[PDB]
Each structure stands twice: as structure tokens, then as C-alpha cells.
Ligand binder design. Sequence first.
Ligand SMILES: [Pd+2]
Lengths: 216, 209
Amino acid sequence: DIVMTQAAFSNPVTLGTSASISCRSSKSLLHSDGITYLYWYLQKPGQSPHLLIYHLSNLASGVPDRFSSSGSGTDFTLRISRVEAEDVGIYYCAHNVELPRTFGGGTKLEIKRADAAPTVSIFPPSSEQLTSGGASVVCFLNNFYPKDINVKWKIDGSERQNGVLNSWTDQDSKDSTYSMSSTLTLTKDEYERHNSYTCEATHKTSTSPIVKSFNR
Amino acid sequence: EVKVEESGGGLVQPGGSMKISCVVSGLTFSNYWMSWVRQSPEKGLEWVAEIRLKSDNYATYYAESVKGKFTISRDDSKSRLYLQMNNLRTEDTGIYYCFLPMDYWGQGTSVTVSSAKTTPPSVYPLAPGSMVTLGCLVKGYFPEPVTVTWNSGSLSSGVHTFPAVLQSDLYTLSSSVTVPSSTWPSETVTCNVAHPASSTKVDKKIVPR
Ligand SMILES: [Pd+2]
């Protein structure tokens, strides 16, 4: 099989500046017919891949001319001239000179933007969930930048790690931020043994955590 | 323009079988080559099978990892492609796309190969105890995926659904929506959750506590 090699990640790219994505192929893709059969696909978050560039340097219909591509039979470069929020996603290179058809691993474009503090919201368990015997406490830490962030749960002032599960979104196509949910999963039995529930977000945008709480 | 739309995915036991298909519109189907490409976090994009045209005696090609297991076929009169997948293993779990080399992709259909059982989600409203943030907790389901929308898709901006987390062979996820304060509860906000594998469609109105 032809191996298409591309790095997993790009150094974050400031909005409005240049991104460059490399690919190489273990076999020349330059055909006797003049064409280099190298293709680029973009997979935006939650989307299917779509064709970006074909035959090395040709833009697919609708693709913005901020996109361009160059290369030999074996080494290739995708350039986006002035990156926009919408361009985030995973960029895949592919050949079309034989079977099997193979793809590169994908290179994720990260956008760099201004630091943004998270907006924190905490939610007590629904009456419905409590009827079912469950008590999950949810905390959303929304639209922050950069990606790195910490959440701490407290029950009646004491730190709780047991039953905490965290999930991070991919970078937002619109504002280039990230969001994270932290869910504290309790049984109704344990939830009703305490009163005050707190989630605290620590992010580089302040030395003080953003603290949200409720009393049961 | 061209539309490629897969169906037939779901859950099956290791050793079992599945048959998926896609229908293509907006081009003359019989004139295009047809392939299936699967996507898993472990292997990325993986081409698995391709079928050529009636003039090629419907010639077929397979990835070495699935030869003998998978059978690709097409019904030009119905504009439909099929993949028959036998003796499935856990590693055959993935999103399967119809890929018309090299220009078109479908939206994928999810195939899970697992001995765990299908379980529908329980859906619970997240209400607070200038903008207001609401949510839906979708708990205790198997397999992936679920889809969450808000007001049947009307609320699209200010929404994000977080990746599902697996515990004890059940998934949980949440979705958050942020709207202006005046609008809710005055106007209704409802999360709509679908879990194709159990044929569950649920709507949960978010009401003030
Ligand atoms: Pd090889």
C-alpha cells in the first residue's frame, strides 16, 4: 500500500494569517499524463469529508481561493492564505494512482484567537431524574480559549472527584472557542445526603476560579 | 446537486452480519464508480470495497482486511449501492461512508459490533436552579450515536453537544443551548433526541424549576 504521511497537528494559526499543511507519499503520484493525482479533503467537525483540491492544485467547486496547493510527485503543501474560523477541521491527503485507495492520517488545523474566559453554568438534577433514582449534576464551561482548563467539584465544601466525567468539544467553527461539560453522577441516595454542590473552573484568563453553586 | 445518503447501520453481535446501502441522486448513478470507506478513531479513513460499471462486468475490489467478509454490489435501476458484511468483528465498528471516487461523500452510517445490548437513553432537562443557558442530559444509552437538536433544529446557533463518554457499556452526553433571557420561559425550548438503534425519538421541554 501507498503510505500518505501527514502530521496529526498544526501549530495554532492566528486568524487572518497563513497556514501550511504538508503531505508526502511513498510512491510518486506524478503520472505520465502530466497530472499529479494528489487530493485534499476537509472534514469539518461533525461533518463528512468533502473534496477541497484535486489533481494537486485544482480547487473544487465553491472552494475559496484562499486555498492553494503545490507539490512534486512525492511531497505536497496545502496553504490557506488568511485563515478564517470556518476553516477548522481535519485535512486529509489522498492519492488516486492505484488500489487500494489510501488516505493520510489527517492534520487538524487549530486556530489561535484571543483568550476568552469560560461562561460557567451549573444544573441541579431534574425532578425526573430523581424519580428514576439518579442524580447527575451538570456543569458547562462554555466558549473559552485556549483549550486547557480545569474543573473542581465540591460537595458541602469538600472536593469530590469520584463520579466525575468530562467531555471537551472540538474547536468551534464560528468563534474558535472550546467548551467542556463536567457531569457529577450520584445516586439519589447519595445526592440527598448533602446540601451544597459547587463546580469551579480554573483557566489561564484569571488566577481565581469561576465558581458556580446551588443548594439542594 | 449530488446527494449521497446511507442507511442500514445499527448494532450486531460479533460473528453476525449487516447489510448497508446508500442511494445517490443528482447524477446518473450507473456512470460512476462506487466505493465504501469506513472511519474509526483507530484506523482513520479506510477504503474497504469498490465496484465499477456495467461495462466492466461490475468488477469489484476489496481491502485485504475484508476480502472474503464483505460483498459490494449495486442496483443501477434503483441508484443504490450495497455492502454485505459477514462474520463481523469488534474492529469492523465504524462509520461507513459511500464514497464516489474521488468527488463525493455520503453522510455515513454507523455500524457497531459488540456483545452489549441496545439500551435507549433517558433524557432529562437541565434548567437553572442577559443570556440564559439550558441543556439536556442524555444518559445510559448504547450504542452510539444519538442526535440532539433544539426546537426541531430551529435553534442552531449557540448550541453544542459534547462528545459521549462511555462507562460500563453505556454512553452519556449532554447538549447545551444558550438563548436570550426574556425568550425563555416565555417562548418554548425543547431538546429532541434520537437514538436510531432503539428507534427512540424523544422531546423534552425545558421548564423553569
Ligand atoms: Pd504498503
